[PDB]
Amino acid sequence: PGRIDRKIEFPPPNEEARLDILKIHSRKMNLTRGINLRKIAELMPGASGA
Amino acid sequence: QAAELFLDTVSTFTSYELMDYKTFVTYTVYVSMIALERPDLREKVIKGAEILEVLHSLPAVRQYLFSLYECRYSVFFQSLAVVEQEMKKDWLFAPHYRYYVREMRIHAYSQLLESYRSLTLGYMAEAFGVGVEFIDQELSRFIAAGRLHCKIDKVNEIVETNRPDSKNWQYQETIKKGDLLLNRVQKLSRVINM
Structure with a gap:
């Protein structure tokens, strides 16, 4: 009944949230630096974190 | 490495x-011209796509590579000249640059002397422009160092090759490193105790 607990929303993935996290999972796989992380994230609206 | x-x-x-x-x-290109063998030297630059453009950007550096594969001995003095001026100003190369000078010499002399079993230094004057006694004392000091053994006839202007080095040099590295290694363990052995 609103009593008692802490309210924290779980946000959907966002563009700017996609950039940094993209680099994070990309830390373990060998690749060159000619990859544009700006254009690749906009192509994936919605979907999910996983 | x-x-x-x-x-x-x-x-x-x-x-x-x-x-x-x-x-x-x-x-990265200055190291590839020593420890990388010629098949593998062009294997890295020609077959490697990422490295092919950057060399095309600088015509001076590219000159040295393609002239090295071209075997032309007139340009090597001029090209290593620039390489040596850049070697001096850049850091960390001060101790090591004087070894490099002769390194590229023996690396050109390798492909040179491997083609013909008998060669004359007067022919070398045409490619070097013009070495007479220069390469005389030069090559002499390369031979005295056990670097690319070749038998040269003095005053007869004849050079002989040979050298089937797979016999003595195969077995010589063993004694060269073995003596230093065991002389190290001799000191460590007498340290303990007192």
Whole structure:
């Protein structure tokens, strides 16, 4: 009944949230630096974190 | 080990801790001309796509590679000249640059003397322009160092090759390193105790 607990929303993935996290999972796989992380994230609206 | 660890090439691209990438091109190419054998030397530059453009950007550095594969001995003095002026100003090369000078000499002399079993130094004057006694004392000091054994006839102007080095040099590395190693363990052995 609103009593008692802490309210924290779980946000959907966002563009700017996609950039940094993209680099994070990309830390373990060998690749060159000619990859544009700006254009690749906009192509994936919605979907999910996983 | 330097060229081996430099195999990543363009995959690191420009980085702050990697300083200038254009100069990284030159540093990685200066090591490939020693420890990399000629089949593998062109294997890295010709077959490697990422490294092919950066060399096309600088015509002075590219000159040295393609002239080295071209075997022309007139340009090597002029090209190594520039390489030596850049070797002096750049750091960390002060101790090591004087070994490099002769390194590229013996690396050109290898492919040189491997083609013909009998050769005359007067023919070398045409490619060197013009060495007479210069290469005389030069080659003499390369021979005295056990670097590329070749038998030269003095005053008869004849050079002989040979050298089937797979006999003595095969077995000579063993004694050269073995003596130093065991002389090290002699000191460590007498340390303990007192």
